[PDB]
Amino acid sequence: PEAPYASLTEIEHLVQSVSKSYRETCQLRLEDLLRQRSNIFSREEVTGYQRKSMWEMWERCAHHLTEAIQYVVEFAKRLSGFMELSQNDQIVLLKAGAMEVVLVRMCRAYNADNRTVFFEGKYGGMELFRALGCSELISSIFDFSHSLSALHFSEDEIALYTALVLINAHRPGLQEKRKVEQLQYNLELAFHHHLCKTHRQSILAKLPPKGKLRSLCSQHVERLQIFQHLHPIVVQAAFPPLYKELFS
Numbered sequence: 520p521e522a523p524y525a526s527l528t529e530i531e532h533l534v535q536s537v538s539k540s541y542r543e544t545c546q547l548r549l550e551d552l553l554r555q556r557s558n559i560f561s562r563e564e565v566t567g568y569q570r571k572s573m574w575e576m577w578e579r580c581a582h583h584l585t586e587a588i589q590y591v592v593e594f595a596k597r598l599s600g601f602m603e604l605s606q607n608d609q610i611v612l613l614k615a616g617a618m619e620v621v622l623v624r625m626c627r628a629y630n631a632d633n634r635t636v637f638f639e640g641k642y643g644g645m646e647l648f649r650a651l652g653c654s655e656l657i658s659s660i661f662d663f664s665h666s667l668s669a670l671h672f673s674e675d676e677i678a679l680y681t682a683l684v685l686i687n688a689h690r691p692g693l694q695e696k697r698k699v700e701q702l703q704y705n706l707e708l709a710f711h712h713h714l715c716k717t718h719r720q721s722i723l724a725k726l727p728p729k730g731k732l733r734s735l736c737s738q739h740v741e742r743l744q745i746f747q748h749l750h751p752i753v754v755q756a757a758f759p760p761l762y763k764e765l766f767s
């Protein structure tokens with residue numbers, strides 16, 4: 520809801536609702552990603568990935584990213600007020616924000632102890648993705664996940680943070696900007712309430728600087744678009760109007 524004078528009841532139900540939506544749209548539970556940290560690709564398995572073609576690695580990565588986006592879109596549609604927005608406004612928020620949320624969620628699958636990430640059943644370093652020839656971009660994604668891992672987000676914290684990545688009234692092309700401002704205001708009030716209540720306000724000053732996530736997402740999506748133009752993946756679109764905006 521967008522209503523003014525959001526009560527303590529509304530705010531705490533917004534926290535619970537967003538956290539449930541987050542937990543139920545994760546590909547794997549946090550406890551399963553943590554329990555798989557000891558399951559690491561052997562040097563033989565890493566060499567097998569490195570000897571794959573650029574196009575086979577592109578297909579594997581693109582497949583995972585398509586699924587990650589689709590989960591974020593499920594998450595967005597569960598956020599209160601989102602499905603009451605116009606289709607234009609839903610697509611404006613997702614086109615910018617969906618990959619930004621995917622990039623934030625990646626930190627759950629990042630192990631800062633040995634700089635590995637979960638990929639197709641085991642953990643491996645960035646040398647696993649050598650065949651793609653995107654060493655600088657993948658290095659920036661690892662760095663960003665490392666910076667987010669240092670915050671030690673609770674499930675509530677990462678849920679509210681990613682809800683605010685999506686429900687942002689400053690995306691160009693919104694026709695109901697005032698309505699999204701009111702939704703965002705209430706999410707910010709919930710986020711700040713929750714952080715104050717749990718004595719975790721110290722994380723606010725440590726969140727990624729204004730524009731860093733947007734910039735990383737821009738570099739990432741630019742690269743994905745170039746790969747798609749040169750070797751298009753065939754996606755069965757779960758959300759055809761959104762798909763048309765990104766793949767046309």
Ligand SMILES: Cc1c(CN2CCN(C(=O)C3CCCC3)[C@@H](C)C2)cc(F)cc1NC(=O)c1cccc(C#N)c1
Nearest residue numbers: 546547580625626628629636637638648653657664742
């Ligand atoms: C794989 C992974 C990377 C590295 N990876 C390199 C290739 N990529 C590109 O975009 C390439 C660069 C442009 C062309 C393709 C991304 C997929 C990122 C970093 C990271 F921080 C976390 C992850 N893993 C997950 O997040 C994950 C995987 C499976 C299940 C779950 C869950 N639940 C999470």
Ligand SMILES: O=C(O)c1ccc(-c2nn(C(=O)c3c(Cl)cccc3C(F)(F)F)c3cccc(F)c23)c(F)c1
Nearest residue numbers: 581584585588617618743744747756757758761762765
């Ligand atoms: O209807 C669907 O099921 C659907 C699934 C994924 C997206 C999607 N893709 N995407 C890519 O960057 C991407 C991916 Cl994940 C893989 C290969 C090629 C691409 C390309 F770069 F071409 F868009 C996005 C970026 C931002 C916001 C998005 F919503 C997407 C989409 F728009 C719709």
